[PDB]
Design an enzyme around this catalytic site. Sequence first.
Site, PDB file in Angstrom:
ATOM      1  N   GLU A  11       7.462 -12.823  -0.426  1.00 50.41           N
ATOM      2  CA  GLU A  11       6.276 -13.669  -0.430  1.00 50.41           C
ATOM      3  C   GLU A  11       6.120 -14.483   0.847  1.00 50.41           C
ATOM      4  O   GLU A  11       5.001 -14.899   1.168  1.00 50.41           O
ATOM      5  CB  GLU A  11       6.306 -14.617  -1.634  1.00 50.41           C
ATOM      6  CG  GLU A  11       6.514 -13.922  -2.973  1.00 50.41           C
ATOM      7  CD  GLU A  11       5.380 -12.982  -3.336  1.00 50.41           C
ATOM      8  OE1 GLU A  11       5.626 -12.017  -4.090  1.00 50.41           O
ATOM      9  OE2 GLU A  11       4.241 -13.208  -2.875  1.00 50.41           O
ATOM     10  N   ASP A  20      -4.040 -13.226   1.338  1.00 49.26           N
ATOM     11  CA  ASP A  20      -2.953 -12.258   1.248  1.00 49.26           C
ATOM     12  C   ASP A  20      -3.380 -10.872   1.728  1.00 49.26           C
ATOM     13  O   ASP A  20      -4.551 -10.642   2.033  1.00 49.26           O
ATOM     14  CB  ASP A  20      -2.425 -12.185  -0.188  1.00 49.26           C
ATOM     15  CG  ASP A  20      -3.431 -11.589  -1.154  1.00 49.26           C
ATOM     16  OD1 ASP A  20      -4.642 -11.599  -0.846  1.00 49.26           O
ATOM     17  OD2 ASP A  20      -3.009 -11.112  -2.228  1.00 49.26           O
TER      18      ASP A  20
END
Length: 556
Positions: A11, A20
């Site tokens: 992450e 993202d």
Amino acid sequence: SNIFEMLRIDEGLRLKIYKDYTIGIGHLLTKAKSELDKAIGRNTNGVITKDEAEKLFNQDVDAAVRGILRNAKLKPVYDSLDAVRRAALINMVFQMGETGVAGFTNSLRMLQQKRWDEAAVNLAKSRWYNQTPNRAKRVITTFRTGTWDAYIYEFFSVDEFSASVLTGKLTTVFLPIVYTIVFVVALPSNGMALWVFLFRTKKKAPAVIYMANLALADLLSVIWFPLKIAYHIHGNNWIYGEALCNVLIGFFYANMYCSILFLTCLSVQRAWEIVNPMGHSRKKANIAIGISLAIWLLILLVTIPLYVVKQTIFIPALQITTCHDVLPEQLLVGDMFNYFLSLAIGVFLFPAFLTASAYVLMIRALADLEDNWETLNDNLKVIEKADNAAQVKDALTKMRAAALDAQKATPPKLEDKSPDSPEMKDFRHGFDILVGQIDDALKLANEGKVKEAQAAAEQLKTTRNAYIQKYLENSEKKRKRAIKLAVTVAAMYLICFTPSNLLLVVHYFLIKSQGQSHVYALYIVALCLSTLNSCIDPFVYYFVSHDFRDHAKNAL
Ligand SMILES: C[C@@H](C1CCCCC1)n1c(-c2cc3c(cc2Br)OCO3)nc2cc(C(=O)Nc3ccc(C#N)cc3)ccc21
Ligand code: NA
């Protein structure tokens, strides 16, 4: 705190809202400012602190575990997984949520049954893998191996046997030389053959049509060789794009299998015109065209799992991007093995069986017709040199049967002529006149008139040159071309088809069984020698096409 450390690598850590919209360590906000202010407790204004990231990440993990045990489909699997694999499961729930991971019902059952390899393959074919491949590989590897190796060592190089071949002179010097020769030889030779069959052949027989697609399959592959040679000269490094790599791979295996199928058609067609000839040269041509389209479309459908799979991979230790030579996803070897084993049976062995047996019937039929024409002339030459009545009657009887068998046989000229056509009726009638005269000499030979039957032999000579020799003049020359044709094809199978398909199964069998194959060097040479078929294909046109011989001899 291995799970916590694993997630940090997947992450990352960013203190500002990024696309993202997420923030911190994989904390999902919405599908964003309002959802962040009440999650932290203050107005972060888009930027959080380095300390608030850890505090929120540590809470997301505790919630991801609670959902797993709450879920009836996730709890039993989690209870069966070792602590290392437990983190991998939590990694998925951390990414796709509790419900998302619960959708992998079949893989979760495999993980519960400790079938790590089967579960890994199932997970490799999903939208999860499509959207985040590098991410999914590390998690999938954790399931398969049960170690933290997927996050300690990033991909760096292939096996030692492959890395030496991909940097050795065998691939960077030997291959581009052989490929260059094939390009210079196969391109204009097949280029002229395709031209002759289209704009110089006015017969349009089924044999010409099969050979026209054979030359086309050759051309559609040899034209890409300038990019193929440059690839190897520069150390097996592809810089032309993934799509263009899959093009070459497609057209490579296409010509590989079109050649086999079009060799089987040509051989069977040419053999079928001798055993049971027909007489619809215009309809049989249209049929042969449709068969070519069927073959052309059947291979377009069968090479789909070659167009659509990732066929390029960057190897850091070698600093090259390989095309085809290295399989980017080592989890698809199970699928690759079956795929090339299916083709090796149904598109290699099966067409080889029909191709070999076609020449078995073809040569024998052309050998029998040869023996009749030879027995005719030989026994006719004996009568003029025999004195006793025994040798005269005997030679007449053997000459009679030789003409009765050649009557049933298909003359070299009337190939596309049906057996009920006038041409065939005149051919057989030419023997009826001859056979009747043999009975008129046998009538004298059986009535004791020795010398009078010898004089009839000169009458038989006239009938031979007038009605028979015209058709069977060059039947022994046609047999020699058929034998050479059978040799040409056998050599093409021995060099281009059999080593490739055999090793293709062996290659993917070892990567599936041991993870490396020692036949990798043989696998490359096999694929290299397979491209020679387009250099041997002109020899096939020379022994089949009559118009191609003229343009071949006149050119050189
Ligand atoms: C019908 C012929 C033509 C004959 C006219 C000159 C263009 C080639 N053809 C061949 C071919 C080429 C050959 C061969 C056999 C075939 Br079947 O033998 C040697 O060369 N491969 C072909 C491939 C395509 C396409 O768009 N695919 C494709 C695109 C995207 C994805 C995805 N995602 C998957 C597949 C179209 C025609 C093709
Ligand atoms: Na070919």
